[PDB]
Amino acid sequence: GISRDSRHKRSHTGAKRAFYRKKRAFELGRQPANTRIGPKRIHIVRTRGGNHKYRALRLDSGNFAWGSEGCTRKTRIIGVVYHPSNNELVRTNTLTKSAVVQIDAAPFRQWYEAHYGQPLGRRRQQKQGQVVEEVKKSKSVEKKQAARFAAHGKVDPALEKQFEAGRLYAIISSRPGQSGRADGYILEGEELAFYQRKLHK
Amino acid sequence: ATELTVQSERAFLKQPHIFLNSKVKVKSTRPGKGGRRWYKDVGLGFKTPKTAIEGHYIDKKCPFTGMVSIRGRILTGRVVSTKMHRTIIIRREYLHYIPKYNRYEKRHKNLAAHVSPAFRVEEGDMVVVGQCRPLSKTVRFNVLRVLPRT
Amino acid sequence: ARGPKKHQKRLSAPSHWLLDKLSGAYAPRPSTGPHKLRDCMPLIVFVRNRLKYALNYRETKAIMMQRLVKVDGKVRTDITYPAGFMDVITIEKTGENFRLIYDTKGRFTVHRITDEEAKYKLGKVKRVQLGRGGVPFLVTHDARTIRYPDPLIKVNDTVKIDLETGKITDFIKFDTGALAMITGGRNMGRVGVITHRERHDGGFGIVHLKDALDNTFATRESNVFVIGSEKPWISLPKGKGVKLTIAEERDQRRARALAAA
RNA sequence: ACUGGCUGGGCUGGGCCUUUCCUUCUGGAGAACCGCAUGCCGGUGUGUCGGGGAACCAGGACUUUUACUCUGAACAAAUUAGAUCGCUUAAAGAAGGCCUAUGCUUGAAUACAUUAGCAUGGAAUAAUAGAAUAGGACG
RNA sequence: UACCUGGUUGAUUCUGCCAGUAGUCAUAUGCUUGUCUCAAAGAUUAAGCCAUGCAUGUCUAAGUAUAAGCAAUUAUACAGCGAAACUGCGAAUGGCUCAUUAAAUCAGUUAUCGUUUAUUUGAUAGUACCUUACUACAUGGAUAACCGUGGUAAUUCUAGAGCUAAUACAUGCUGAAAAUCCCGACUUCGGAAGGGAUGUAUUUAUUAGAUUAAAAACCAAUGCCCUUCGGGGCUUUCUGGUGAUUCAUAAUAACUUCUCGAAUCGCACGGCCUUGCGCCGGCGAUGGUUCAUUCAAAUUUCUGCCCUAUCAACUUUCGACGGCUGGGUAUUGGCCAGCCGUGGUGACAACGGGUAACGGAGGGUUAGGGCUCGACCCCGGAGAAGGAGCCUGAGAAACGGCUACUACA
RNA sequence: AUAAGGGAAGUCGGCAAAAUAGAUCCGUAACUUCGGGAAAAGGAUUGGCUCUAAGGGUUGGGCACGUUGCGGCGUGCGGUUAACAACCAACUUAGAACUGGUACGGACAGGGGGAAUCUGACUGUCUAAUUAAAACAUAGCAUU
Ligand SMILES: [Mg+2]
Ligand SMILES: [Mg+2]
Ligand SMILES: [Mg+2]
Ligand SMILES: [Mg+2]
Ligand SMILES: [Mg+2]
Ligand SMILES: [Mg+2]
Ligand SMILES: [Mg+2]
Ligand SMILES: [Mg+2]
Ligand SMILES: [Mg+2]
Ligand SMILES: [Mg+2]
Ligand SMILES: [Mg+2]
Ligand SMILES: [Mg+2]
Ligand SMILES: [Mg+2]
Ligand SMILES: [Mg+2]
Ligand SMILES: [Mg+2]
Ligand SMILES: [Mg+2]
Ligand SMILES: [Mg+2]
Ligand SMILES: [Mg+2]
Ligand SMILES: [Mg+2]
Ligand SMILES: [Mg+2]
Ligand SMILES: [Mg+2]
Ligand SMILES: [Mg+2]
Ligand SMILES: [Mg+2]
Ligand SMILES: [Mg+2]
Ligand SMILES: [Mg+2]
Ligand SMILES: [Mg+2]
Ligand SMILES: [Mg+2]
Ligand SMILES: [Mg+2]
Ligand SMILES: [Mg+2]
């Protein structure tokens, strides 16, 4: 099958090597698995030394981490929008490591509401469609929450518009072909601005 | 070296596991711990160049601000080509002894090494190289110090 | 070659095993264990070729079957068990104890030891650090691992082991003025006192020793075996490992021969 | 068995001064020299002396670089040279030997290989660098 | 043992070759042949083709026994030997040969802070809640051997019918406290009831992993003791290792067709009291997470191989030199997929052609320097008529393992 | 105009007909007057639909004052935007996915080739109405 030896290559002087030996059990290769977003599907493979690996064919969720706060919540993936390697990979909605994706902001918004008592990214006030208020059963919370707000700080202007739409850009930091997991963190700041500048021009 | 800009490529280059966008600001002397540029010292009485400390270049093959360690044999040679990108070719000369004729003859070999953007190397310069892990098909050495020219 | 080997061909065995080149084609091939393959003392070779208790191979495996002889206080049931430096083998029925130790000519020899003091050992540490859960531990030259050590103990030192409870009773630092024995290389059996150590950055340092007869010699750190500072704790064999040259060796054999008869 | 001697011949040095002699820091350690108390008959073993500070050890800072040579470390069993033991000698072999023993004891050595790589001393012979538009050395 | 003699001419001295002479662990062949110690032998030409027989199986007091098996008759659950068969392990070790192969193999010297590792040896795991509960004094269905009935000229080919076991397969709870972070019912403004989580494996993000001279001065927040009642102070926990790491290890927020944390087996017979089939209690086989060790394996740094120029330029179609982003592999790497530069070796002999070429330790021949041989008892590499592909297994691109083509049969 | 199987066995003689044919990418011998032979010989691709990438033009760049009614100027004096912003405009080249009764220069248009001998060097010209050739002419050479 596929071989990963360097014997069949040609030396740096241009000389052509001669036949030495047949292909060996080690130095082998395996068929690549092209991960796509869809309902979950994972296959098992028995690798060297009796261990096992996981070929991921279709995934729909994975862990993504918010940097400054430090929270990781499981959510669903909307689509992939950029990949530094090949453009044809991007649109076909195939997922690998270091792929820029777009994610749903509902779990992060709800956690933000629970941890901090302030609303984040709400321009629906013009519609007043989903206005609702629930009486909060305490008074000790305000000193703690206002202390957190006055100490930690405020979010940068770029990120609230993304939360207003409910979709955020992120970069995959996991190995889908190796571990069968799509993991990453939401990207922000000047590193975000580089991608936004490149994405639409 | 002379580099016009640091980000002139399709992807974004950054040092791994170096957090760069932190809400709280803390000033620390440590290179990588506080959140600013990271660097260390290889050892063997080799001093980190000054240009590295304040430089902005990103390199995964430089012995400084990189993920490569210098270990193994240390060699010397004569530089013959420095006109390609981030790679140099060195020539080393020696004398072989023929026992039957009771006298020597000269021989030479060619070597390929990776040059960091911290140094600026031109033709006819003295260099010292150290062994490292395979960086390419035929690149296994890294430059550490350039001696002043005659 | 499609896996690891399981046979060892005779005429390739280590020289210090002292195997005749005739009378067979194969060698015992000691099994895997705590000691290196190159420098080990198989139990079958020791019992049959040195003590002359067993005539040939067939009854050699029968002898161990009664569990009469033990090493390091624990019974071993494989005939080709790799014994090594400093190891103590105890036979209760006959009433003597043996320790495998180099002679002055670089081979294993029989050495009687007393029963009461033959119940402890000592070995050099290879690396010291904390393991899982933050518990510090060390490993010696005979694959003995001990957790929670003395914080002053560092690498390359030697530690005294009780051999019954595995507690760190005592230890010896590695510094100048200590008494050491070489364990690898050509300088087999010499005993000397550390004079001074100079190190070379990049590995493979050398150390200089000096014999009792004002001789001077050097060896690698991986080959030095410290057994005390003064008045060595273990009992050295006859000759004290001084390596007189052939001139005095020839003088002494006729001198004692003529003195006796 | 064998001792002294001979300004005996050297031979290998190890200190000096000649305009030259030998870089350097910290820490450990620690004697010598003089003296003391007590022992004694002017110094010592006391030392749990102080005016001490040979030599050593463990660590920092610098030193033109090669070729060359000396001494070390590391490196295979077998083979070659080569020491010992009367398989009746020998080619071989690593055995055996000792009064009488219901026992004791030893050997199974050593040098070379020689190319490349790692340390140390020597500094002739053969190459290389340095202050001239001073862009030179020092406080 | 550092040695020579015969041959051109009418006779002489030389260059020069022809001949003689000796060794061979160097082969063939001829004549002849009594004894003693040791014993190489279808390598050379055909890595050409093979009838016949053999060369790999394995059981302990200790995995699974209802043999219409034997033997006894203390074991009414058994207890010896136990055919057969299930299950576990080995069969990738040994043995043969030298076809290909000219920086390829190999040798000496380095390395893995760039990986996998059966077995042996030594240490090592409070299931917090799930599932008030499922049973824990212990879970649930098949199958072998076997009785009996068949097919084909033919094989270590097999059908359907009826039973029953696991250390085969599949599930599943029981010996503690401290501690940690969120949410907080509560309001007095300080606080406070209560809820939940937290072994190990996997993957990602973040934090700590200190140094090696000292002296003040404020400002904001703003601790005690002493106390004169204004105040005087201020003193201060650990923190490993390498020449060198993002190292060893700890902590936080979560996740998972997802592991492990023991429903196994046998030979020896004791202690308590509330006296009930009550409780406690010693040595060994078959396992199991992580670390250490051993046998190793794959890659990897430097230098060293026969003759030939009537072989002087070679390499990048369809990777040739290097950069970047990924895929794949046990891991690094142009090993592979995309984008961007135009490189790399050579008269100091590259590239190619010959080799009646496996490499080395080494054999033959000697003043010294050398010449020649090395398939072959020791080490390393490759192959089983010629090519490729693959299962099981830690380990195979295996041929006394399978699949397909070609040539024989 | 078309024909099963054979493919020049027909005939003085492959006469007539058939076969190849555009463009892009590979590959190309003997011989030679070194210019050629060469489109040598011999191979692969070609539709529809939805996308990606490359090849351009025009207008703008700081202060410090003085006329003319926020503007054209007159000037003096610094920096080269680590090349930015807006608008305008036709075609040519390369690459990818999907799709079909495997078809796609779909009509038209459109070279058969190779190994040798005789003869004239080549381009050119003539018997209008039976012969276009080896005949004539040609540059070169030699003579009067
Ligand atoms: Mg090291
Ligand atoms: Mg043959
Ligand atoms: Mg054959
Ligand atoms: Mg039984
Ligand atoms: Mg051959
Ligand atoms: Mg174990
Ligand atoms: Mg099981
Ligand atoms: Mg060149
Ligand atoms: Mg061959
Ligand atoms: Mg050989
Ligand atoms: Mg072999
Ligand atoms: Mg094979
Ligand atoms: Mg095969
Ligand atoms: Mg066979
Ligand atoms: Mg086989
Ligand atoms: Mg027809
Ligand atoms: Mg037809
Ligand atoms: Mg035809
Ligand atoms: Mg005809
Ligand atoms: Mg006819
Ligand atoms: Mg025609
Ligand atoms: Mg053509
Ligand atoms: Mg032609
Ligand atoms: Mg197409
Ligand atoms: Mg066509
Ligand atoms: Mg003719
Ligand atoms: Mg014509
Ligand atoms: Mg006419
Ligand atoms: Mg006509």
PDB file of C-alpha atoms (C1' of nucleotides) in Angstrom, chain D residues 2-138:
ATOM      1  C1'   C D   2      75.546  -7.108  52.187  1.00  0.00           C
ATOM      2  C1'   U D   3      76.170  -1.286  54.076  1.00  0.00           C
ATOM      3  C1'   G D   4      78.036   3.303  54.100  1.00  0.00           C
ATOM      4  C1'   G D   5      80.939   6.512  51.286  1.00  0.00           C
ATOM      5  C1'   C D   6      82.962   9.244  46.558  1.00  0.00           C
ATOM      6  C1'   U D   7      82.745  18.437  46.122  1.00  0.00           C
ATOM      7  C1'   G D   8      82.038  10.495  41.374  1.00  0.00           C
ATOM      8  C1'   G D   9      79.302  10.826  36.843  1.00  0.00           C
ATOM      9  C1'   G D  10      75.316  12.283  35.534  1.00  0.00           C
ATOM     10  C1'   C D  11      69.906  12.335  34.887  1.00  0.00           C
ATOM     11  C1'   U D  12      64.872  14.450  35.685  1.00  0.00           C
ATOM     12  C1'   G D  13      63.794  18.646  37.680  1.00  0.00           C
ATOM     13  C1'   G D  14      61.923  22.620  41.238  1.00  0.00           C
ATOM     14  C1'   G D  15      62.608  27.350  43.056  1.00  0.00           C
ATOM     15  C1'   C D  16      64.952  32.207  42.515  1.00  0.00           C
ATOM     16  C1'   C D  17      67.184  37.305  40.627  1.00  0.00           C
ATOM     17  C1'   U D  18      68.700  39.311  35.837  1.00  0.00           C
ATOM     18  C1'   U D  19      63.747  45.334  32.229  1.00  0.00           C
ATOM     19  C1'   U D  20      60.993  38.683  31.908  1.00  0.00           C
ATOM     20  C1'   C D  21      58.170  34.590  37.217  1.00  0.00           C
ATOM     21  C1'   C D  22      52.811  32.858  35.795  1.00  0.00           C
ATOM     22  C1'   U D  23      45.379  35.879  34.919  1.00  0.00           C
ATOM     23  C1'   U D  24      41.379  36.292  38.316  1.00  0.00           C
ATOM     24  C1'   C D  25      36.739  36.368  42.118  1.00  0.00           C
ATOM     25  C1'   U D  26      33.618  33.962  46.109  1.00  0.00           C
ATOM     26  C1'   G D  27      32.761  30.117  49.428  1.00  0.00           C
ATOM     27  C1'   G D  28      34.247  25.837  52.094  1.00  0.00           C
ATOM     28  C1'   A D  29      38.150  23.648  54.325  1.00  0.00           C
ATOM     29  C1'   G D  30      42.472  24.245  56.755  1.00  0.00           C
ATOM     30  C1'   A D  31      47.829  23.420  58.543  1.00  0.00           C
ATOM     31  C1'   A D  32      52.546  25.796  59.229  1.00  0.00           C
ATOM     32  C1'   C D  33      55.217  29.832  62.229  1.00  0.00           C
ATOM     33  C1'   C D  34      55.417  32.220  67.078  1.00  0.00           C
ATOM     34  C1'   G D  35      53.492  32.243  71.780  1.00  0.00           C
ATOM     35  C1'   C D  36      49.644  30.589  75.987  1.00  0.00           C
ATOM     36  C1'   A D  37      46.750  27.322  80.087  1.00  0.00           C
ATOM     37  C1'   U D  38      47.647  22.417  81.903  1.00  0.00           C
ATOM     38  C1'   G D  39      50.932  18.562  81.704  1.00  0.00           C
ATOM     39  C1'   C D  40      56.220  19.645  82.225  1.00  0.00           C
ATOM     40  C1'   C D  41      61.543  21.035  81.853  1.00  0.00           C
ATOM     41  C1'   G D  42      59.880  27.219  76.993  1.00  0.00           C
ATOM     42  C1'   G D  43      57.865  24.487  73.962  1.00  0.00           C
ATOM     43  C1'   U D  44      54.505  20.737  72.718  1.00  0.00           C
ATOM     44  C1'   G D  45      50.190  16.074  72.361  1.00  0.00           C
ATOM     45  C1'   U D  46      46.061  19.197  74.948  1.00  0.00           C
ATOM     46  C1'   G D  47      43.609  22.843  71.203  1.00  0.00           C
ATOM     47  C1'   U D  48      36.617  22.569  72.942  1.00  0.00           C
ATOM     48  C1'   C D  49      44.663  28.562  71.051  1.00  0.00           C
ATOM     49  C1'   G D  50      44.644  33.596  68.344  1.00  0.00           C
ATOM     50  C1'   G D  51      47.921  37.091  65.709  1.00  0.00           C
ATOM     51  C1'   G D  52      46.536  32.770  61.890  1.00  0.00           C
ATOM     52  C1'   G D  53      45.859  31.690  56.245  1.00  0.00           C
ATOM     53  C1'   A D  54      50.805  26.784  52.895  1.00  0.00           C
ATOM     54  C1'   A D  55      48.318  23.511  50.179  1.00  0.00           C
ATOM     55  C1'   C D  56      43.518  21.600  48.585  1.00  0.00           C
ATOM     56  C1'   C D  57      38.330  21.378  47.066  1.00  0.00           C
ATOM     57  C1'   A D  58      33.781  23.280  44.989  1.00  0.00           C
ATOM     58  C1'   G D  59      31.925  26.783  42.113  1.00  0.00           C
ATOM     59  C1'   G D  60      32.258  32.657  38.571  1.00  0.00           C
ATOM     60  C1'   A D  61      35.458  36.124  34.696  1.00  0.00           C
ATOM     61  C1'   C D  62      38.925  36.441  30.549  1.00  0.00           C
ATOM     62  C1'   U D  63      42.801  32.945  26.545  1.00  0.00           C
ATOM     63  C1'   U D  64      44.167  33.972  18.110  1.00  0.00           C
ATOM     64  C1'   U D  65      42.769  29.690  15.419  1.00  0.00           C
ATOM     65  C1'   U D  66      44.620  25.043  12.685  1.00  0.00           C
ATOM     66  C1'   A D  67      48.494  21.447  11.604  1.00  0.00           C
ATOM     67  C1'   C D  68      51.873  18.645  14.709  1.00  0.00           C
ATOM     68  C1'   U D  69      53.630  15.356  19.029  1.00  0.00           C
ATOM     69  C1'   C D  70      53.366  12.995  24.455  1.00  0.00           C
ATOM     70  C1'   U D  71      50.217  10.809  28.086  1.00  0.00           C
ATOM     71  C1'   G D  72      45.064   9.166  29.290  1.00  0.00           C
ATOM     72  C1'   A D  73      39.758   7.424  28.681  1.00  0.00           C
ATOM     73  C1'   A D  74      36.385   4.500  25.534  1.00  0.00           C
ATOM     74  C1'   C D  75      36.742   0.191  21.948  1.00  0.00           C
ATOM     75  C1'   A D  76      34.638  -8.169  20.288  1.00  0.00           C
ATOM     76  C1'   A D  77      34.436 -12.852  21.006  1.00  0.00           C
ATOM     77  C1'   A D  78      37.634 -15.595  17.850  1.00  0.00           C
ATOM     78  C1'   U D  79      42.761 -14.890  15.594  1.00  0.00           C
ATOM     79  C1'   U D  80      48.415 -13.292  15.812  1.00  0.00           C
ATOM     80  C1'   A D  81      52.714 -12.574  19.233  1.00  0.00           C
ATOM     81  C1'   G D  82      53.243 -14.115  23.944  1.00  0.00           C
ATOM     82  C1'   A D  83      53.480 -16.309  30.345  1.00  0.00           C
ATOM     83  C1'   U D  84      52.059 -20.893  33.165  1.00  0.00           C
ATOM     84  C1'   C D  85      50.391 -26.592  33.500  1.00  0.00           C
ATOM     85  C1'   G D  86      54.605 -33.441  30.781  1.00  0.00           C
ATOM     86  C1'   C D  87      47.035 -34.815  27.202  1.00  0.00           C
ATOM     87  C1'   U D  88      53.478 -40.799  27.534  1.00  0.00           C
ATOM     88  C1'   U D  89      56.136 -35.946  23.471  1.00  0.00           C
ATOM     89  C1'   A D  90      53.704 -33.111  19.697  1.00  0.00           C
ATOM     90  C1'   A D  91      49.408 -30.605  16.647  1.00  0.00           C
ATOM     91  C1'   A D  92      45.763 -29.349  20.681  1.00  0.00           C
ATOM     92  C1'   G D  93      43.457 -28.147  25.448  1.00  0.00           C
ATOM     93  C1'   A D  94      42.685 -24.256  30.083  1.00  0.00           C
ATOM     94  C1'   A D  95      43.494 -27.311  32.876  1.00  0.00           C
ATOM     95  C1'   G D  96      45.228 -28.715  37.817  1.00  0.00           C
ATOM     96  C1'   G D  97      48.159 -29.138  42.128  1.00  0.00           C
ATOM     97  C1'   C D  98      49.134 -30.541  47.686  1.00  0.00           C
ATOM     98  C1'   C D  99      50.076 -35.045  53.416  1.00  0.00           C
ATOM     99  C1'   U D 100      46.685 -39.815  53.425  1.00  0.00           C
ATOM    100  C1'   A D 101      42.731 -37.009  54.508  1.00  0.00           C
ATOM    101  C1'   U D 102      35.189 -37.787  55.340  1.00  0.00           C
ATOM    102  C1'   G D 103      40.091 -31.460  53.060  1.00  0.00           C
ATOM    103  C1'   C D 104      42.794 -27.027  51.295  1.00  0.00           C
ATOM    104  C1'   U D 105      44.621 -23.697  47.211  1.00  0.00           C
ATOM    105  C1'   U D 106      45.626 -21.176  42.359  1.00  0.00           C
ATOM    106  C1'   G D 107      45.641 -19.889  37.232  1.00  0.00           C
ATOM    107  C1'   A D 108      42.419 -19.291  33.105  1.00  0.00           C
ATOM    108  C1'   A D 109      47.436 -13.214  32.223  1.00  0.00           C
ATOM    109  C1'   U D 110      49.750  -9.103  29.014  1.00  0.00           C
ATOM    110  C1'   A D 111      51.299  -5.662  24.633  1.00  0.00           C
ATOM    111  C1'   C D 112      50.062  -4.226  19.520  1.00  0.00           C
ATOM    112  C1'   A D 113      46.198  -3.127  16.094  1.00  0.00           C
ATOM    113  C1'   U D 114      44.956   2.739  14.269  1.00  0.00           C
ATOM    114  C1'   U D 115      41.402   5.349  10.375  1.00  0.00           C
ATOM    115  C1'   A D 116      37.849   8.853  12.602  1.00  0.00           C
ATOM    116  C1'   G D 117      35.964  11.001  17.431  1.00  0.00           C
ATOM    117  C1'   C D 118      36.891  12.874  23.258  1.00  0.00           C
ATOM    118  C1'   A D 119      40.456  15.120  27.249  1.00  0.00           C
ATOM    119  C1'   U D 120      45.880  16.617  29.144  1.00  0.00           C
ATOM    120  C1'   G D 121      51.295  18.672  28.840  1.00  0.00           C
ATOM    121  C1'   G D 122      54.966  20.599  25.503  1.00  0.00           C
ATOM    122  C1'   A D 123      55.254  25.422  22.065  1.00  0.00           C
ATOM    123  C1'   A D 124      60.566  24.044  17.697  1.00  0.00           C
ATOM    124  C1'   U D 125      59.067  23.155  12.734  1.00  0.00           C
ATOM    125  C1'   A D 126      54.593  24.593   8.626  1.00  0.00           C
ATOM    126  C1'   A D 127      50.192  28.046   7.877  1.00  0.00           C
ATOM    127  C1'   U D 128      46.614  32.179  10.008  1.00  0.00           C
ATOM    128  C1'   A D 129      44.715  37.113  12.713  1.00  0.00           C
ATOM    129  C1'   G D 130      46.178  42.157  15.006  1.00  0.00           C
ATOM    130  C1'   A D 131      47.180  49.696  15.602  1.00  0.00           C
ATOM    131  C1'   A D 132      48.183  53.705   9.184  1.00  0.00           C
ATOM    132  C1'   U D 133      42.275  58.197   6.794  1.00  0.00           C
ATOM    133  C1'   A D 134      43.751  55.278  14.153  1.00  0.00           C
ATOM    134  C1'   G D 135      37.278  53.196  13.613  1.00  0.00           C
ATOM    135  C1'   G D 136      43.901  51.571  18.328  1.00  0.00           C
ATOM    136  C1'   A D 137      45.138  50.156  24.355  1.00  0.00           C
ATOM    137  C1'   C D 138      44.277  52.214  29.623  1.00  0.00           C
TER     138        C D 138
END
